Amino acid sequence: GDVEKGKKIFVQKCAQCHTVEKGGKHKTGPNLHGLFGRKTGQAPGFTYTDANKNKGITWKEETLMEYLENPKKYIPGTKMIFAGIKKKTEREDLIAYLKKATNE
């Protein structure tokens, strides 16, 4: 749960299409503020695939751990183009960082 290595993974691997700050803007991928604790496909103003919208699960560490590994497998037909973070640590790191930054 190194929030400090998580941030690197985020910038190196998510920042292209995503913003985590409040008031932050939708890029290719939506803004992730208020992520934790909300259903999938909830960011306002963004245009979700119907999959991402109907997944209907709640984001929190458990569902993230699972999604980051093969997003396409977690939400088949998701417009997000991203293979997944294979190693568990990275995924905990990156989850540590999002729990933090999408809530601050």
Q: For residues 68 and 76, is the Cβ–Cβ distance under 8 A? A: no
CB of 13 to ligand HEC, least distance (A): 4
Is 65 annotated as contributing to ligand binding?
no
CB of 45 to ligand HEC, least distance (A): 12
**Length of the chain, please?**
104
Q: Which H or E element spans position 68?
A: helix 61-69
DSSP string, 45-66: T----HHHHHT--B-SHHHHHH
CB of 89 to ligand HEC, least distance (A): 14
Q: Which residues bind ligand HEC (CB under 6 A)?
A: 13-14, 16-18, 28-30, 40-43, 48-49, 51-52, 78-82
Binding residues for heme c: 14, 17-18, 80
